[PDB]
Amino acid sequence: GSHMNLKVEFFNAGTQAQSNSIYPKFRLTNTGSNAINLADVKLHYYFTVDGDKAQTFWCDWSPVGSSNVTGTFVKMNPTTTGADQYLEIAFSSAAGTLAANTSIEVQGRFAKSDWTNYNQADDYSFNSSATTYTSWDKVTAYSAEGLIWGIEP
Ligand SMILES: [Ca+2]
Ligand code: NI
Known about the structure:
Ca(2+) 1 binds at residues 48, 50, 119, 122-123. The protein is mostly beta strands. The chain has a single domain, classed as Endoglucanase-like (Immunoglobulin-like, Sandwich), CATH 2.60.40.710. The chain has strands at 6-12, 18-19, 24-30, 36-37, 42-47, 55-61, 69-80, 83-91, 97-98, 102-112, 118-119, 134-135, 140-143, 146-149. It is globular.
């Protein structure tokens, strides 16, 4: 009612269909009056891997300190349209809190260990058109309570 006031905006920094990397950019805004503990916040980006390989996420920049933002990859079960895996982004305790009526960006890439290609065009979370942050319900966010933003596939 006031404890999940996290607005999530998103775009893709690189929009090549055949791409050796995926470039998620999130903007998270605390739209409420109470601080949000980022250590409890998770984000998901859903996609089809187009050839499963070990993957790595890098956060290149966030105001909270890029080293405090990490990613792991999970398989969808069962798989569904546009989604056989997701990236899950997490924040460490050193990321701190997100103050009332403030926002932070989280800018990351991910790639396969052998740098082989993805097809972005079929990915559930991919936005082929946005060039700026946009309110996007095809990425999800979570608190300790569970889902707080978006539509899971
Ligand atoms: Ca794909
Ligand atoms: Ni609430």
